[PDB]
């Protein structure tokens, strides 16, 4: 049971891996793409007040 | 991958940086740390009533 | 056992890294700019009540 | 592992930092713009009712 409990926590490093790159890539990425959607829907709600 | 592990390797040495953390280095394979007198020691030889 | 523990404790490291790294940039970035965007829908409904 | 357990902890206060500054932010800059927004709204509902 150790040595199968073992395994699982080896086995559970490739689960924070791929956590840590998916993290990474949506700071990189989706993070500033939405900023710039949200700037564009800024200015249209001041066309539509206007 | 992405360099995970490349990220972690530096966080702890600037983290932990500073102190000093050697852990001794002990053989136990050694005759010392084994009872001399194996098979052929008195302390195997049958005791007599 | 604890071995293996240990480097997944090492390795936890690099998602805190990146977790504080993308709450700063929503700090610095994201926030300042849905304040624009709920100041310009605050001007949209007084001209609505116009 | 205690010294990997220590790192996490000593890294653990950036993350508090970042929150109270986030917090900070909010309470100072998103509320005070939030009551200005339900008060326009607040208007709009009576003129509707007239």
Same mark, same amino acid.
């Given at each position: 049971?150790?040595?199968?409990e !073992?395994?699982?926590?080896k086995?559970?490093?490739s689960?924070? #891996?791929?956590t !840590?790159?998916?993290?990474?890539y949506?700071? #990189? #990425?989706?993070?500033?793409?939405?900023?710039?959607?949200?700037?564009?829907?800024?200015?249209?709600?001041?066309?539509?007040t206007? | 991958?992405?360099?995970?592990?490349?990220?972690?390797?530096?966080?702890?040495?600037?983290?932990?940086a500073?102190?000093?953390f050697?852990?001794?280095?002990?053989?136990? #394979?050694?005759?010392?740390?084994?009872?001399?007198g194996?098979?052929?020691?008195?302390?195997?030889?049958?005791?007599?009533?």
């Amino acid at each position: 049971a150790t040595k199968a409990e !073992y395994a699982l926590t080896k086995l559970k490093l490739s689960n924070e #891996s791929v956590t !840590y790159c998916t993290a990474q890539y949506n700071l #990189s #990425s989706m993070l500033p793409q939405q900023l710039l959607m949200l700037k564009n829907q800024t200015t249209q709600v001041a066309e539509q007040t206007k | 991958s992405c360099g995970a592990e490349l990220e972690a390797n530096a966080l702890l040495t600037a983290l932990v940086a500073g102190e000093d953390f050697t852990l001794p280095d002990i053989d136990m #394979s050694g005759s010392e740390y084994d009872i001399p007198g194996g098979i052929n020691s008195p302390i195997y030889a049958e005791i007599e009533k």
